Design a protein around this ligand. Structure first.
Ligand code: SF4
Ligand SMILES: [Zn+2]
Ligand SMILES: [Zn+2]
Lengths: 329, 182, 434
């Protein structure tokens, strides 16, 4: 409904029941519903034509190793299980089978100076690799990480294969004069890899999945929690402020009026968090002119992406300010 | 932000309000229950302790009435719905209004009130404390010399006792350590 | 002095008064912060460091003479105090550090005064090997003890109840060749006894500490303990001494005169600034503003003061009504309660409210960059040695004491009289000395 004009950017004329008899008494508007359905399917295709669902899902399944016919249908158990089992049964185990965060009290208050958006894309695969956790590698019956002095085992090895394949993509991407075909191939491939990497930990918290060894999940949560906490106190040192936190996001204050030193502070903290751990990444994604805070998932802001020549496009953004009581004047 | 104590006079017909033990000004200060407020009339409400007692209970026994019947009200400052049929879905803050499906729900008489108010009662009947906390020697000695018998004291003691026991009966002052460190 | 001195253990599952709960919380936190301050002020063995603490500590109900088994009052208070604050600091390393470190040093002090017999017997009650030599062995082994270690001078070793040990926990007293050996039952002066006690204490204590932090969610389903859930180190003091409407009445004109001798650096500099600019931002005044209620002048008088400093700086004499003065007045109205209806405490002008370009609200000792601030403070006609020893503590990121030493100097009086926490208390003092 909304998507009709967000990505697709057109109109969606819709007709309830009581006008269906009107259109029974009508040839122009009935035919109009017909051509409307025509355009409906059309826009429905344009969805794929732009988002490139087909080759994306295709490549994913290719790397996933499971029935694409059961892929579109929706699932995270499949695109994790039927992938992991590939390797796990090169390692002559025997698995079981089928049967039947932290808020940080967002300090609401308008903000005037520029605001930066830190993304912890790839946080859970990151921490898991960083601390070499794998089923075989914990006396799981409160649990504790072993000495990293062992050789990395099974699951982080697969995570590492995925990460280095992302590295491969990022390396060969810097080419020039490539046919737009292989260009899009690369970019979409990278997207797909990031998709499954973010999916990764999901294969555990979903109790009804096979590998639901919950102590794993408890441990990982504890770890990421302390991760975020250290992050907060470290940047807190830096004479700045930290308004909103979440498992996979940090909305942070910047407290300045310039535009370039901003990126310097970005790169600064980008290296700071790396001083904690190398494999862990961070993304200096977006910049806000001024911003209002009501809740996560519900606020108002000015997306200010820096256009070339140090200029910037500025658009409003109203994340969820509806007016439900259709009663006013 | 609580509700004061209002009181009916048994003889003069007027009404009263009992905020703090002492009735106002400094060296002049006098006990609450001493004289009816209405300037002229000279009845002294103290001598009707027991009657006061009644209203005390017959008042508290509606505050509790509210809570266990606690309303439920909406939060998103537009919706403003009021009901009791607690719905079943849930989220971080708690449950969610059925209409404004994007918002929480709050109790009305937040327990914090109820306990606050019961403290507010137990406050103004336990003069002993406020007497002890008083600074100036001579004021204390003179007023005690004046009109703090065993009788007056004992009557305060009686009503204050009723209040205090009636809250500490069982709701809130306890924190069961045996479940807090397991 | 009391039985109190004991190694924390075994959470006491009673059931208690909510009031007493938050009471103990505040009390103990006060004790901690204080001990830290008192310590960082002087050096340990100085008798100020003793007198002051043994005054405060005894004042807050934790150390008196002999009584019954464990339901004696102050020992019980100590007990429940700790085993509450345990729930306080389970959410950092820095926090858990600070808590450990402080409790450590406290126990050190509070223990260093017990009578010697009580010392050794309570060590006995603590664990097994905590046992004492016979002083005959002092004569028998003076050569061994003295010549063995350099931790003793000459022959004058006092009548210390030296102790028998298992080497198995001597793990540094001996490998450093600092003690005689009798089949690992080395004999060491009391000093290292205190040392080892404190080290095993730190170990066991941290080992316990981590556990609760691994077992938090219970509290999450209650909100009575919402402050101590994670709300101690924040913008409430010990308590509101310099609160609304304390001693003071002074006419407008005198303010500037008093300024040059009474305004803590933050204020003083902001008042200079508004003396020059005659204009201020949306937030700024809302510090200075409430700070004035410190002395508590009447609104219409304060309104008049601000009017002078407003329209002389060309602020439209009509806006004033429906603009600034409006909220300036409301600052004594209905809502503002604990938000505006209060003055500010340094721990609100430090831990938050970032000060921006060219603005003045905010702790200088924090936000003012170091050497610019060096010349700046020096411009108050200050000996550079004081400025240096001050900037030292300033980079020690503990500032109240810096403000303190500054005042100490600028009035030359060699006691701070207190441990400052609120600028208005600072002011009431500065007026006290007159
Ligand atoms: S003690 Fe705090 S409020 Fe007072 S001058 Fe120093 S930094 Fe400012
Ligand atoms: Zn009457
Ligand atoms: Zn609703």
């Amino acid at each position: 409904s909304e998507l009709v004009q967000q990505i697709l950017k057109t109109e969606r004329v819709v007709i309830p029941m009581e006008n269906i008899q009107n259109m029974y008494s009508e040839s122009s508007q009935l035919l109009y519903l017909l051509e409307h359905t025509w355009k409906d399917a059309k826009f429905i295709l344009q969805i794929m034509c732009e988002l490139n669902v087909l080759p994306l899902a295709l490549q994913i399944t290719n790397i996933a190793g499971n029935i694409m016919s059961r892929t579109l249908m929706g699932g995270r158990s499949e695109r994790n299980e039927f992938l992991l089992l590939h390797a796990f049964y090169e390692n002559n185990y025997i698995v079981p089978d089928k049967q039947i965060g932290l808020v940080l009290d967002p300090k609401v208050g308008f903000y005037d100076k520029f605001i930066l958006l830190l993304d912890f894309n790839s946080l859970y695969p990151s921490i898991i690799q960083e601390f070499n956790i794998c089923f075989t590698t914990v006396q799981r019956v409160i649990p504790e990480l072993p000495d990293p002095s062992l050789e990395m085992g099974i699951l982080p090895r697969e995570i590492r294969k995925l990460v280095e394949r992302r590295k491969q993509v990022k390396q060969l991407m810097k080419q020039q004069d490539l046919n737009p075909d292989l260009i899009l191939q690369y970019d979409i491939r990278q997207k797909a890899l990031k998709l499954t990497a973010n999916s990764m930990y999901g294969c555990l918290g979903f109790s009804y999945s096979r590998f639901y060894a919950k102590p794993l999940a408890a441990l990982v949560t504890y770890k990421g929690r302390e991760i975020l906490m250290h992050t907060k106190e470290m940047v807190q040192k830096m004479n700045l402020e930290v308004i909103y936190g979440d498992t996979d996001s940090i909305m942070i204050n910047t407290n300045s009026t310039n535009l370039e030193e901003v990126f310097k502070l970005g790169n600064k903290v980008k290296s700071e968090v790396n001083k904690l751990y190398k494999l862990l990444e961070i993304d200096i994604d977006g910049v806000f002119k001024s911003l209002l805070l009501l809740k996560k998932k519900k606020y108002a802001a000015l997306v200010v992406e820096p256009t070339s020549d140090g200029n910037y496009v500025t658009k409003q953004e109203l994340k969820g300010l509806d007016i439900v009581r259709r009663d006013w004047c | 932000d609580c509700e004061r104590f209002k009181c009916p006079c048994p003889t003069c017909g007027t009404e009263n309000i009992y905020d703090n033990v002492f009735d106002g000004s400094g060296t002049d200060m006098e006990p609450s229950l001493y004289r009816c407020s209405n300037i002229d009339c000279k009845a002294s409400p103290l001598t009707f302790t027991v009657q006061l007692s009644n209203k005390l209970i017959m008042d508290i026994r509606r505050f509790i009435k509210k809570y266990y019947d606690g309303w439920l009200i909406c939060e998103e400052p537009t919706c403003r719905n009021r009901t009791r049929h607690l719905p079943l879905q849930f989220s971080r803050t708690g449950p969610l209004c059925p209409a404004c499906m994007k918002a929480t729900l709050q109790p009305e008489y937040s327990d914090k009130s109820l306990y606050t108010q019961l403290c507010f009662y137990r406050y103004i009947f336990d003069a002993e404390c406020a007497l002890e906390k008083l600074t100036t020697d001579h004021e204390k000695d003179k007023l005690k010399k004046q009109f703090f018998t065993p009788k007056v004291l004992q009557d305060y003691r009686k009503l204050k006792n009723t209040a205090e026991q009636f809250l500490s009966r069982s709701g809130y002052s306890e924190v069961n350590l045996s479940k807090l460190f397991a | 002095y009391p039985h109190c001195l004991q190694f924390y253990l075994q959470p006491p599952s009673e059931n208690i008064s909510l009031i007493e709960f938050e009471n103990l919380a505040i009390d103990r936190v006060k004790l901690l912060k204080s001990v830290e301050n008192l310590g960082v002020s002087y050096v340990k063995g100085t008798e100020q460091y003793q007198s002051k603490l043994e005054s405060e500590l005894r004042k807050l109900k934790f150390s008196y003479r002999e009584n019954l088994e464990d339901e004696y009052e102050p020992r019980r208070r100590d007990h429940i105090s700790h085993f509450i604050l345990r729930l306080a600091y389970c959410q950092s390393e820095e926090l858990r550090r600070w808590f450990i470190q402080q409790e450590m040093d406290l126990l050190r002090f509070r223990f260093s005064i017990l009578p010697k017999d009580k010392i050794q017997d309570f060590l006995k009650d603590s664990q097994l090997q905590f046992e004492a030599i016979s002083d005959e062995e002092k004569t028998l082994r003076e050569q061994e003890i003295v010549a063995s270690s350099p931790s003793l001078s000459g022959l004058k070793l006092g009548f210390e109840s030296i102790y028998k040990i298992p080497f198995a926990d001597a793990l540094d007293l001996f490998r450093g060749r600092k003690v005689y050996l009798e089949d690992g039952f080395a004999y060491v002066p009391l000093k290292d006894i205190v040392a080892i006690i404190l080290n095993e204490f730190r170990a066991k204590l941290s080992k316990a500490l981590a556990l609760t932090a691994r077992s938090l969610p219970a509290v999450q389903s209650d909100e009575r303990l919402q402050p101590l859930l994670n709300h101690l180190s924040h913008s409430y003091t010990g308590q509101d001494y310099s609160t609304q409407g304390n001693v003071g009445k002074i006419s407008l004109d005198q303010i500037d005169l008093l300024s040059t001798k009474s305004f803590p650096p933050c204020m003083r500099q902001l008042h200079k600034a508004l003396r020059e600019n005659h204009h201020l931002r949306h937030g700024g005044r809302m510090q200075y503003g409430l700070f004035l209620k410190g002395i508590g002048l009447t609104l219409e008088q304060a309104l008049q003061f601000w009017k002078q400093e407003f329209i002389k700086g060309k602020m439209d004499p009509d806006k004033f009504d429906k603009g600034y003065s409006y909220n300036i007045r409301h600052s004594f109205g209905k809502e503002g309660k604990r938000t505006d209806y209060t003055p500010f405490s340094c721990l609100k002008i430090i831990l938050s409210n970032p000060p921006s370009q060219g603005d003045y609200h905010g702790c200088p000792f924090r936000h003012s960059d170091p050497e610019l601030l060096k010349q700046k403070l020096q411009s108050y006609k200050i000996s550079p040695g004081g400025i240096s020893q001050i900037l030292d503590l300033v980079k020690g990121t503990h500032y109240q004491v810096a403000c303190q030493k500054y005042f100490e100097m600028i009035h030359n009086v060699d006691d701070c009289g207190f441990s400052l926490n609120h600028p208005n208390q600072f002011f009431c003092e500065s007026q006290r000395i007159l």
